[PDB]
Amino acid sequence: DEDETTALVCDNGSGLVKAGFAGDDAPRAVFPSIVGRPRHQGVMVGMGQKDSYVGDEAQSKRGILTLKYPIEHGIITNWDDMEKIWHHTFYNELRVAPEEHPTLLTEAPLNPKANREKMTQIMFETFNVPAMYVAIQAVLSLYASGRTTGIVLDSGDGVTHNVPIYEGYALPHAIMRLDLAGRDLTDYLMKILTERGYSFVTTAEREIVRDIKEKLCYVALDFENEMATAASSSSLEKSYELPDGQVITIGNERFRCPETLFQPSFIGMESAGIHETTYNSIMKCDIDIRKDLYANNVMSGGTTMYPGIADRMQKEITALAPSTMKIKIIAPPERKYSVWIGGSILASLSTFQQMWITKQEYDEAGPSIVHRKCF
Amino acid sequence: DEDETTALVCDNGSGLVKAGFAGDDAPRAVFPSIVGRPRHQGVMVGMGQKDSYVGDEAQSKRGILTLKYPIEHGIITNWDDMEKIWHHTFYNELRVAPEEHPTLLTEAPLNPKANREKMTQIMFETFNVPAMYVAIQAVLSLYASGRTTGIVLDSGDGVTHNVPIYEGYALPHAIMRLDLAGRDLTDYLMKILTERGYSFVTTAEREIVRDIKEKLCYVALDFENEMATAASSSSLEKSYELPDGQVITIGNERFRCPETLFQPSFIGMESAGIHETTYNSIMKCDIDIRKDLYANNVMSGGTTMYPGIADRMQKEITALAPSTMKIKIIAPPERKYSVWIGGSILASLSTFQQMWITKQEYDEAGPSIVHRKCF
Amino acid sequence: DEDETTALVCDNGSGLVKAGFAGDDAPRAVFPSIVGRPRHQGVMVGMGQKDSYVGDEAQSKRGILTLKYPIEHGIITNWDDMEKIWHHTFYNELRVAPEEHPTLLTEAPLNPKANREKMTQIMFETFNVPAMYVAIQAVLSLYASGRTTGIVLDSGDGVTHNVPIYEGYALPHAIMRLDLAGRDLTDYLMKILTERGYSFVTTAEREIVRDIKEKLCYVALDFENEMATAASSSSLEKSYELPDGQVITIGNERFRCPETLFQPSFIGMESAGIHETTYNSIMKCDIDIRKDLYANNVMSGGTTMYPGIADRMQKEITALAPSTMKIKIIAPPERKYSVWIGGSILASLSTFQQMWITKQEYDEAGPSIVHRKCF
Fold this sequence. Notes:
The structure is cut from a larger assembly and holds 3 copies of chain A. By secondary structure, chain A is α/β, with parallel strands linked by helices. Chain A folds into 4 domains: 5-31 and 73-138 and 338-371, 2-Layer Sandwich (Nucleotidyltransferase, domain 5); 32-72, Actin, Chain A, domain 2, CATH 2.30.36; 139-185 and 275-337, ATPase, nucleotide binding domain (Nucleotidyltransferase, domain 5); 186-274, Actin, Chain A, domain 4. Chain A is 34% helix and 14% strand. In chain A, the strands form 2 sheets. Chain A has a 6-stranded mixed sheet with strand order 3-2-1-4-5-12, with helices on both faces. In chain A, strands 6, 7, 8, 9, 10 and 11 form a 6-stranded mixed sheet that branches. In chain A, β7 (160-166) and β8 form a beta hairpin. The PDB classes it as motor protein. The entry lists the keywords actin filament, actin, acromsomal bundle, cryoem, motor protein. The entry is titled "Actin filament model from extended form of acromsomal bundle in the Limulus sperm".
């Protein structure tokens, strides 16, 4: 017990952190990974004039901020903010003490040697956690699927990826990435709205554009019919209500914004997203593994979650792929949190006492062991 | 004992003083802060030529006096009138010997350094009280509400005020004063009662119109339905008996005077009243305030008390505010007295023996220490 | 002539409307966008029961009326009120027959388009104007500067904006609206005056504090020093007398409010103010047009007319900008009407007989052709 369920899992995600204990099905703490600092002196009536707090406190909610998004594009960018974040992860969010709990964290698909180490320097030297672990975001998604071989295509908030997996780890020459994903299409949804209207330009009109992404967005299975069919009498017309009585008629719009992730092109770079990108990821992968991977293409993230995406993947990657390979997407129900759940199962596991990085090993060898125990 | 409840508390309020001791629920002395002086060499009563009268004395004998008001616009203008008043406060009202009682005097929330220092001068250097404290009114009103988390919107008699507090650090650029309040409203009630027919000609016809305000009046929860239906058959008629048996019927007048505190404007520019003035005791500074403020919006003072003001505030700030904030007003029972009460409870506090400004601290260091021990 | 001078222009701003004819240097009608409605049945001196008043006439009757603001944040939220405004704009304000008059009406930087079109319905279907145009406000401020290319910051009433225009094409991907502007930076100044020493009595006096910003208010070149400096001996001290004998000794206040536009502050509204939000508008638009953006940064609008604001802008954006790139503000003398002057010239234009959206095209194809004629 004392290790086995007290183990923690804390996905440092591209916009939101997911923390908890191990062997929980779904995260104990979820928060926008943002800290900031005063542009002016200012107090309320409350307690004592503090320097920086974190998350939904400073995001739903950021006036005197200088917003720092310290984990940009899934690689922890600022470490004074990150530390404050983990302080908030324990002594606010999980209501626990660091020296008591081993932690499992996730990292970037190409997290550099020394950043993985920088994580480990802080987690022992300020946080003093008794044991710890960090595993790559993608391997944990395929592990939440529970397949040892495959190809994960992660398009969460600030990063799109493709990582083959076969019997244990990843393949960095195949591994694709893209810096435009779950965020970038929400603002773009505001454009397509602001070609319809909209107008959404308060903060409270901008952060609701986000939610309209989550509901009203679809991925068009054939844009040729659909876009044109929207403008007759038809359907496509849906609506939302504002904080007041104004209806938000959105029709010939709903499907335009996800389509982007299925061909992001922009004047003198072509940022080919989701599909051809798998074919070229697997075409850099092992030739004997390819077959399985064609059938074991799995998705994860916020912006893999739009309605229509799986069918849309199913037709597309096939048209590209060599017709003897039985191809098939695995995009499970829980695929916005899978990165974490893989972690949870990876910690509450009878074998895992071997794979912990401990107190002692750290003092003896220093952070490079956390690289060498991984690969 | 020798300090504890020998400790005095004395609110210098814009028209009214509240003196007393530490550890009392309700003020021991209360008087109208008028200073009279005869316009005639009139050898008076059981003692002949008197230079002055203070409190109700000055209010009876007005016809022979000139009336002075030292705490005008929140602050201590002339220090001979003040000192006369405090001599009345101790040597007449409280009946104490000044040299055995620590005092607490209050201070107007934008009380200049030297003005705090000048209360500090007179208490020790002439009154010779062994110890003292000067206290930011909105911090005493705060405390009394069992909270340090809560924005005082003081609106007394000659003052409106919104002061936000960081455990003492009362923000020096969100604090507000706005002098249109209980006095402006009383003269308004006279005005409207005259349009109605009536003649508030003499002093005996004039000071009754104040008390009518204090009790018979209301704040509309919507000004349409009220200020239409009242002019018919309906309700809303109330009546007062005079110094004689002539009844004074008030119906379309009653609820206009408190309404004023919310909505002036006519034609020109763009400005605020209570609600918008609390929407910019909002827009000011700190990132991690807000969620506290909107839910913990307090009120205090003489012109806060008229029936309807809480529910009227509660709709109003909410329509202005972005609709993710859980908003809630707080308007306590005793809210023309809180200013003193939390004062009193703050002097009978076990933590306070560091805080008292003493004889010695003053002979060693002198005046500024009262400010420097606080802000 | 028959088209040329008889063309109208009517900038529907978030508080004030600006109207007139083609060619004219300065607007023929400037009115408050106040539809006021009665809470009463009754008759005025010589005039019977009307359902509404619009502009100044409504404002004068406040006590008996309910006011609304239909063009909140720049966007037409209620169409009963809007239609009432335009009906007043022709049949009262511009004193002409609409069916003889092409009209040019502005629209917010990213307006609604279902609303550009709803505006296109009412103007033909009820006001039968022979032709008309709807024009993007900020594009008309760069058009008052006679340029095809430049980034425009328009901070008018409850509108603040950043628009990058390249060769007559307003890039919707960088367009900020901020929601702290000419109003918000008055209502606050209102009360800091009152903190010091003031009050505003009854139904009218709220609306003197825009004139106070527009005349007195300074943008300090350093806030830390100036804050202390004001409270020493120093200067800052000047005074404004009322329409009665109350002097407004404002000194220590005068600089604090224009400063707000260089980073508005509280919590549930991010507002990196003026400087960073331009940088983050420009950096959404490409380098080969960034050279023309940094040289061609523009400001129109009431509150960007501040004493200090150009010089402050000049230091403040440059501290964020990549260092060799040459910057200079385009903030011309007439920058509180520019939006209408863009319109007036754009009607008085030899080429425009192809660019009128005609009587006929409307009956054949309907409203969206007015957005499709724009692009």
